[PDB]
Write a protein that binds this ligand. Structure first.
Ligand SMILES: O=P(O)(O)OC[C@H]1O[C@H](OP(=O)(O)OP(=O)(O)O)[C@H](O)[C@@H]1O
Ligand SMILES: O=P(O)(O)OC[C@H]1O[C@H](OP(=O)(O)OP(=O)(O)O)[C@H](O)[C@@H]1O
Ligand SMILES: [Cl-]
Ligand SMILES: [Cl-]
Ligand SMILES: [Cl-]
Ligand SMILES: [Cl-]
Ligand SMILES: [Cl-]
Ligand SMILES: [Cl-]
Ligand SMILES: [Cl-]
Ligand SMILES: [Cl-]
Ligand SMILES: [Cl-]
Ligand SMILES: [Mg+2]
Ligand SMILES: [Mg+2]
Ligand SMILES: [Mg+2]
Ligand SMILES: [Mg+2]
Lengths: 208, 379, 208, 379, 379, 378
C-alpha cells in the first residue's frame, strides 16, 4: 500500500476525531463498532485507517506500520514519544492526569503505594514532588485499587470527576493537562509529506 | 534529594520510636541472659562470607580496603559475625548472644522490601535439644507482647531436614533438586504432579507440597522407606512439639509448610517465619543453623518494620517564654535552669528559645512566669 | 474485611467459574453484567468477589488485595507466578499458546519481528528454539500486526483457530497448553487455610 | 579472624555500655529540643557528596545501585544528610536536629584510629547568633557531665573568619594563603616570621600565631585596619563570650587557637575541638558551617571513644538452679517467673537453664530454693 | 543463548566483512594523515566523563576499580579519550587522530538499535577554519566511495551557533529555550507559531523552522539585530561553503536544518548528520566540539551498520581431498603443501582435513587429484 | 591523565602495528579454514558465565541491564562465547573458529599484567584425535614465524588428566586436592614431601612435582595402580608425541610440567604455555577443554607482540601549502589524482590546512618544480 495509514484510538478519541477527518476529505465508509474489519478504507483512496487500543497507537506509528496517528498525551507520556514527531495538538478529548485517593482518608505514615496504568508518569510526578513511592502496574480499571487496599492512591485521567466520585474517591493533585495529539512516523514525514501536508493543513484550519 | 529504592529516612517521632524499640528489645534480651555483641559494619570477605550461600554473596556489597588492597564486604547478615565471635569466645558449652545493628542488601528481599534494615536478633549456640528453640520462641513472644500491638503475628513452621533426607534417599540429581525447590516455592501442584510421576520417590516429594500442612498425618502418608528414616521421624516430631507449645503456651495460630526451603544452604533443621498481619515479607525469620561441630539456632527481625504497628505516649513538647526568660536576673535564671533540668529528667522536651519566633515542632505546652513562679500550661 | 476476597476475570473465566462457586456454597447476589459494582458480596458472608481485567488478577492476588483468584495460565506465565501458589488446574477455557503468521507466507530469512501481548513468553520460547527475535509489546488485538507488517509473527492464545483464519492468519508453532488456574496468595494460604480448605475441596471435587 | 585496621568488635560489657551511652545521650538531646533523625547508611552520591570537600569524597566508599546502575556511597559523615533533611523539612525558621549512627571511612584519621565510628551529634539551623553556639555547648557539657568520667575534656576554640578576613584585606594569592596555612598547621614560627616580612599586613598573620592564644588582648595587638574590621571584631568578641561561658558555667579549661584552620572550606566561623586527656584526635569536633543562605552550627563525636572513659556498675548475672526449678509444680513455677520478671525489670540478667551444665558467663549469683523460698546467693 | 537487546553476534562472512571494513577504513584514514590511536575500553570516570553531557553520563556503564576503590567507566564515546591524548601529545598546532573501537551504551538510541557499536572516526584538533570541516568531508566521502555501495548517503547540515546566538540576543530563559527545542525536534509549526508570537524576536525563531532549509536567503529573512550579529553571519556563511563543496566536489544531496539541536551541549558550531537510504538513525554524526581553548572537529560512525550495505566477492572455500592426500608419498605431500601455501597467500581458505568427514562450512571447491595433477573442481 | 593500573593506551605507530598484526594474524587463521566470529563485548551472565570457574567469575566485571534488571558481564574470555556459538551453529562434525577482540579483567593476572588485552585465538571443536592439537600447534607456529621476531618462544607442556586420575584413584577430598594444588603452584617440594607422606598414593603426587619434567621415565616411576590406569598412560603418551612433534617439525625447546594445574576446572587434558623470551606471563595459553563435544584451542594477547615486532618505516608526505594554493581548479584536480595514487601505494599524505601544518614524523615533501610535482626527502 503506497498511501497513508492512519492509526486511531477507539472510543472518545474516535468520536471527536471524525469531524476533523471529515473536513480533511477522509471519511470512513462504514461504522468500525459494527465491523469485523481491522483495516478500513476511506473516501480518500490514498488513506486507510486502523482502529487500535489507545496504548498501541504510538507503537504502530513509531515502527512504520502506520504513517501517522491520533493519541492522547497521557499515552505518549507513558509510552515515551521519542521516535515520533508530535506535529499537532488537536485540542480534543481534553482531560487531566490526576492522583486520586479514597474520599476523606488520611495519608498513611508508611511509604505510599500507587496503583496505575501510568507507571512512568507516576514515578516522574512523585519524583518532582520529592516523595518516594512504590508503584504497581495495572492494565484495567484503577478505581477499585484504593478500595481493597492495593494502593493508597491511583493516577488516572479525570474529566468531570464523576467516575471518581461514583466509586467513593476524590481527585487530589493535578499532574498535567491532556489532549489528543497527531503523531507522525519520522520516515513518513520525509517520504510522504506531499500526501500528508493537505491533511495537516485541514486539521490545523479545523482547530483555529 | 531522592533516595534509592528500598532506602528510607526514619525521621522525628518515628526515629524516636525506633530508638525506644531498639533499646527496649535489646535490654529485654540482655535480661534473659543473652550477651550483647556489636560487631562492625564491614569485615574482610574471607571472614564475612566464610561458608556463605550464593544468595548471601550476591546480597553483600563489596568494597576495597586501600590499606591492604583486599576485598571487604558491608554485612548483609549479622549471624556470620556471631559465628566468628562464638568460635573465639564461646567454648564448648551453651552460649547466648544478642545484637542490633544496621545491615545493607544489594537488592530488596521481596516486594518493595527495605535494603537498609535495622536487624535485631538472638542466638543460642551449643544446645542440640529442641528446648533451645522453645526458649527462643518464648523470649521472642515475650518481646512481642511487651510492644502492646494490635497487629497479630502468624507463625509458619517448616523443617528442611524432611526434604533433604528424601533427596538423599531418592539419590536426586542437583537439577531435579533445583526443579523441585522451584516448584515448591510457587506450590505449583499441577506441574509438580507431572514432574513427580517420573522421579524416584516422587510420591513423597508430591506429598510434601500437597499434604505438608497436615503435620499430624504426614508420616503415615510417606513411603515405607521414608517412614523408617529416623531423621525424618525426628523432624516431624520436632514440628509437632513446637506447634503444640505455640498453641498451648502462647495461643498462637500456627501453619506448617515442610516445603519452605528458602535458606536451604544455611538452615539445618526447623525453620520459623513470623508474619505481621497480611504483610508479604516475614517480620521474624529464624531457625536452626550450623556453627563452626557446633549446634546453633536463632532469629532476627527488622526493627524498622515494627514502627507502623507500635505507639508511644504523646510527647510533652515545652517552650519557655522568650520575653519573661530575658527579664530574669542571673539567680532567677539559675533556678529556672534547675527547674528545666528536672522537667527534662522526667522526659519533657524543653526548648530554651533563641528568639521570640523560635518555636519547637509539635508544641504542646508553654512554661510561663506568673507571680514569680514558672508553670506549665497547654497551648 | 476478615473473609476471603476472590479475584475473577470477566468473560469466559467468570461464566465457567460461577458453577464451581455455586457447588462451594458461594453465589453472587446479583448479575455482574447489569451492575456498576466492582466489589460483589455473596450468599456466603465470608466471601466477596472482585471483577478485574484478566492481566490484573495475578497482581491483586500476589499483593494480598485478593486472597485467591482464577487466572489463565497464559497470564500467569507472562506475569510470573513466583509470589502466588498455583493450586489447581480448573480445566476451563482450555486453549493453546501459539505463534501465528500470514496464511502461506513463508518466513523471511532476516531477523524475526514478534508482535505480542505475551512478550516474556515469546522471548523465552524463541530463546529455546535458538531464534534471535525483535519483540514488540502490544496491549490490544494482535491479528492486525502481521497484515500491516508490524511483525512477521504473533504469539497469541488459539482454541478453534477461527479468529486466525477469519483474519487471513494461520497457526504455526505450538508453544504450550493453557487453562485457567486457581491461584492463592501465600500469606492467605497460611493464615486463612480454614476458610480456604472447604472451597478448594469443593472445586477439586467438582473438577475430578 | 583478622579484622581490617580501624575495625573492631565491641563485645559483651563494652557492647552493653555502648548501648547505654547511645540511648542516654540520644534521650538527653531529645529532651533539649533536638529532633532525632535516622538517615540511612547509603545514598546516591548526588545528595551524599553535594558540595563535599575533596577529603570527604575520598573518605566515602563507592558502590553501584543494581536497580539503576547509578553511583551510591556509604556515608562518611551524617551532616550532609541533615542538610538534605533540613532543606525539605526545616522551613525558614530555627530547626534543631540530632542523630546517632554508624559511619564508614576509607582511611583512619589518627594512628590506629577507627574507620567505623558510632557518630553522635546535634545541629542548629537558621540562627545567626552566637546564642546558638552557646546552646550547643550547654547541651554538649550537660551530656558530658552525665557520663561521670574521671577523664578531663580540654576545649580548643578557633575562628576561621579572622584569618579569612585578613587574607581578603591583604589581597593574598592562593599560593601565599596555602603557604601560611601549612606553616600554621606545622607551628613553624621562624619561617612564618620570614614569609610575613614580605606580605601585605604580614605582621597581622604573625600576630595570630604568636599572640592569638591571649584572646583578651588580641584585638589591640592587630593593625589599625584589622582592628577596625567588623568581622574580625565580631569574631574575637564571639571567642571571648564562648570562652567565658565554658569556664564559668561549665568549669571547662579553654585554650584559644585562631590558627586552627583544618576544614577551611566547610567551616564558616567559630570552631570547637574537645580533647579527652592527652589523646591526639579530638573526641568532639564542632563549629559553624553552611546550610542550603542558611545558617548552621553543630558538633559530632564517636560514641565508641567514650567506652574507655566511662564505667557502669557491675552487672548482676543470675542463674536459676536447674534441679530445683524442674521439681516445681506449675503454680510454683508461675510464682518464680513473676519473681524473675521483677528481677529482670530491675536490670538483673536472669538465665533460665536448658541443662544442669548451662552456666552464664560472669556468673555472680544463683537464685536457689532453700526452705520453700527463692533467694539470691553470691557464688 | 538469548542475548540482551541491542547486542548481536557478528558471525562468519559478516565478521569477515566487518574485519575488512575496519581494516581498509582505518588504512584510508592513515593515508590521509590521521594518526591512529587505540585507547582502552575502560578508564577512571574523572578522565572519561570530564565535561561530559548528562546524556553521555547516563549512557556510560559504571564499574569499580578493585585496586583503588575508584570509579571507572566502560566507554560510550571515544572522543573524550582523544581529548585526553591530544592534551598530552598534541601541542598547540594542528593534530589529526583516527580510531576504530568497540563502545558500549547503557540504552539503545534507535528502535531495536545497537548498544555495542564498533565506532570508527577521525578528528582534527587546532584549526579554527572551515577548511578543517571541508577536509573531514573529503576524507569521509573518499571512504564512503571506496565501499562501492548502492545505498545513497544523504547529508543534513546544521549549525548550533545560529540558534544559540538568537537565544542570547532574545534573552530567552532556560524553560523558553527548552520549549523551542522540543517544538523544533517535533516539527510542531502551529504551536511554534503561537509561542513565537509571545516571544522577543519570535519571528526569527519561527523563520529557522519554516525557512532554515533555504540557506541562500536565510540571513535576508532574519531581523536587523540578527543580521548585525557577526557569529550568526559567519555561521550562515560556513553553511553555504560546506553546501557548495558537497555539491561541487562530491555531488552530494544536501539538506540544511538549522533547527537540528541534538547534542546542544557538546556541539559548538557546524554539525553534519549522514543518513543511509531511509534509516532513521544517522550513520555518520559529525561537527565542531571543544578540546577541553582548543579547536576540534570530527566525525564517527558505527562500522557494523555498513555490513547490510556492502558486499565482498564470494569466498573460495577449498577442501583438500582426505583419501587422496593420505595415499601420497612424502615428496608429493610437500609439493601439494607448497601449492596450498600459494593458494592461501592469494586469499583462498584451504582446510587440511583431519578425517574423511571433515567438511568446512560453505564449501565451494575441492582440491582433488586427477591424472597425476592437483586441480580445483567446483562442488 | 592517569589510567588505571594494567590499562594502557596503544598510540600512533604502535596502534598502526597492532592493527596490522591483528589483521594479518586473523587473515592467516581464515586461510587455514578457521571461521571468523566476532561475539559481543557484553552478554547476560547466564550465558557468559555458564559453568564458569570461580576465577573467571571474579575476573568478570558485572553490570546491570536497565531494560530487564538482569546482570550482564563484560567478557574476560572469548572461549565461553565460542562454546555458545558452536552449540547453535556447529553441528556434530568438526568445526573451526577464530576470533580477535578486547577482553576486560577486574584484576591483573600476575606481575604487572594487563587488564585490557586484545585477545586473539583459534579453536577446533569435534575432533578427539591428537591430530587437532597438532594442527593448532602448526598453525600457531606458522603465525609466530610470519611475524619474523628475533625473540624466541619457549613452550611448556602439561596435562591435567594425570593428576585428575591419581586424585580419583586415591579418593582425595576437596581440601587435600586444593592443598596439593597450592603446593604444586609454587613447587614447594619440602612441604609437599611432608603432606604426601600422610596421603594415599602420596609418593605418586610427590613424583609428579619432582620427576614430572622427565616425561620419558615418568610412567616407570609411578605406582603399579597408576601404571595400569589407561587414561594416565594415554596422557603421558600425548605429552611425548607433542614434544617430539614440536622438536622435529619446529626445532622448539620444550619443557614438561605435569603439575601445571592453573585453570584446573576448564582444562580436560593437554595444556600448552608459550613464553616469549624470559617474560613471566605466557604469551600463548592453550589446551583441551569441554564443548559430549571435544574442543581444543589457544589464545594470545596481540598487544604483547608490539615490543617484539617491527614494520617498515612509514612514508609521511606533506604537500607544499603555497604551491597548492597557487594552482587553478584544473591543476588542483590533477594533483589530487596524483595524491590518490600515492595513498593507494601506502604513502601518508597530508593536504595542509595552513603553511605551518606539519605531520608528525615528516619524511617527504611533495613540491612543485617546472609544472610538475615530485617527492623530495627532508
Ligand atoms: O472524569 P470522568 O468524566 O468520569 O471520566 C474519567 C474516565 O475516563 C477514563 O476512562 P475512559 O474514558 O477510557 O473509559 P470510559 O469512557 O468507559 O470511562 C478514566 O479511566 C475514567 O474512567
Ligand atoms: O481460536 P479461537 O477459538 O478463535 O479463539 C482465539 C481467540 O480468543 C482470544 O480472544 P479474547 O480472549 O479477546 O476473547 P474474544 O474472542 O471473545 O474477544 C484471543 O485473543 C483469540 O483471538
Ligand atoms: Cl472530587
Ligand atoms: Cl514511508
Ligand atoms: Cl532483617
Ligand atoms: Cl517489551
Ligand atoms: Cl490455522
Ligand atoms: Cl491473610
Ligand atoms: Cl565521628
Ligand atoms: Cl557509533
Ligand atoms: Cl589474552
Ligand atoms: Mg541471621
Ligand atoms: Mg559532621
Ligand atoms: Mg565521538
Ligand atoms: Mg580462552
Amino acid at each position: 500500500f503506497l498511501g497513508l495509514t492512519l492509526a486511531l484510538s477507539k472510543g472518545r478519541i474516535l468520536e471527536e476525531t471524525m469531524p476533523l477527518l471529515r473536513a480533511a476529505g477522509v471519511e470512513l465508509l462504514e461504522d468500525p463498532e459494527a465491523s469485523r474489519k481491522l483495516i478500513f478504507p476511506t473516501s480518500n483512496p490514498n488513506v486507510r485507517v486502523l482502529i487500535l487500543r489507545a496504548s498501541d497507537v504510538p507503537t504502530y506509528v513509531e515502527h512504520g506500520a502506520a504513517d501517522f496517528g491520533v493519541a492522547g498525551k497521557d499515552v505518549l507520556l507513558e509510552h515515551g514519544a521519542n521516535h515520533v514527531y508530535e506535529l499537532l495538538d488537536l485540542k480534543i478529548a481534553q482531560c487531566k492526569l490526576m492522583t486520586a485517593g479514597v474520599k476523606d482518608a488520611p495519608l498513611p505514615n508508611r511509604r505510599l503505594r500507587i496503583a496505575t496504568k501510568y507507571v512512568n508518569v507516576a514515578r516522574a510526578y512523585f519524583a518532582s514532588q520529592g516523595q518516594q513511592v512504590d508503584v504497581i502496574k495495572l492494565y484495567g480499571s484503577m478505581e477499585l485499587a484504593p478500595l481493597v487496599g492495593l494502593g493508597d492512591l491511583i493516577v488516572d485521567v479525570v474529566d468531570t470527576g464523576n467516575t471518581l466520585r461514583a466509586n467513593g474517591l476524590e481527585a487530589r493533585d493535578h499532574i498535567c493537562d491532556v489532549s489528543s495529539r497527531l503523531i507522525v512516523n519520522q520516515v513518513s514525514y520525509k517520504r510522504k509529506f506531499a500526501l500528508l501536508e493537505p491533511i495537516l493543513d485541514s486539521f490545523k484550519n479545523s482547530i483555529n | 534529594g531522592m533516595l534509592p529504592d528500598g532506602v528510607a529516612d526514619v525521621l522525628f517521632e518515628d526515629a524516636h520510636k525506633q530508638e525506644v524499640l531498639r533499646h527496649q528489645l535489646t535490654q529485654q534480651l540482655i535480661t534473659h541472659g543473652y550477651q550483647l555483641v556489636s560487631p562492625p559494619m564491614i569485615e574482610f570477605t574471607e571472614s564475612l562470607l566464610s561458608g556463605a550461600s550464593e544468595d548471601l554473596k550476591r546480597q553483600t556489597f563489596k568494597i576495597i580496603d586501600q590499606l591492604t588492597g583486599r576485598l571487604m564486604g558491608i554485612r548483609a547478615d549479622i549471624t556470620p559475625q556471631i559465628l566468628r565471635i562464638d568460635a573465639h569466645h564461646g567454648g564448648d558449652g551453651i552460649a547466648r548472644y544478642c545484637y542490633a545493628g544496621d545491615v545493607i542488601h544489594t537488592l530488596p528481599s521481596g516486594l518493595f522490601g527495605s535494603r537498609t534494615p535495622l536487624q535485631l536478633g538472638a542466638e543460642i549456640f551449643g544446645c542440640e535439644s529442641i528446648a533451645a528453640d522453645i526458649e527462643l520462641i518464648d523470649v521472642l513472644f515475650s518481646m512481642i507482647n511487651s510492644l502492646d500491638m494490635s497487629a497479630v503475628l502468624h507463625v509458619d513452621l517448616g523443617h528442611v531436614t524432611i526434604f533433604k533426607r528424601l533427596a538423599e534417599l531418592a539419590a536426586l540429581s542437583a537439577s531435579d533438586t533445583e526443579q523441585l525447590m522451584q516448584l515448591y516455592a510457587n506450590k505449583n501442584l499441577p506441574e509438580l504432579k507431572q514432574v513427580c510421576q517420573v522421579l524416584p520417590m516422587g510420591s513423597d516429594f508430591y506429598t510434601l507440597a500437597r499434604f505438608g500442612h497436615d503435620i499430624a498425618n504426614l508420616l503415615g502418608r510417606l513411603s515405607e522407606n521414608a517412614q523408617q528414616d529416623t531423621k525424618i521421624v525426628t523432624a516431624i516430631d520436632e514440628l509437632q512439639r513446637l506447634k503444640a507449645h505455640l498453641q498451648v503456651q502462647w495461643q498462637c495460630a500456627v501453619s506448617i509448610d515442610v516445603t519452605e526451603l528458602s535458606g536451604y544452604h544455611y538452615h539445618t533443621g526447623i525453620v520459623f517465619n513470623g508474619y505481621i498481619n497480611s504483610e508479604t515479607q516475614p517480620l521474624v525469620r529464624g531457625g536452626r543453623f550450623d556453627g563452626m561441630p557446633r549446634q546453633a539456632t536463632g532469629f532476627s527481625m527488622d526493627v524498622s518494620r515494627l514502627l507502623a504497628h507500635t505507639q508511644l505516649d504523646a510527647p510533652f513538647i515545652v517552650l519557655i517564654d522568650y520575653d519573661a526568660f530575658n527579664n530574669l536576673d542571673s539567680a532567677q535564671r539559675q533556678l529556672l535552669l534547675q527547674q528545666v533540668a528536672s522537667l527534662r529528667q522526667q522526659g519533657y522536651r524543653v526548648t530554651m528559645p533563641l528568639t521570640a519566633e523560635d518555636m519547637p515542632v509539635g508544641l504542646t505546652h508553654r512554661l510561663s512566669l506568673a507571680d514569680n513562679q514558672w508553670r506549665l500550661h497547654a497551648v
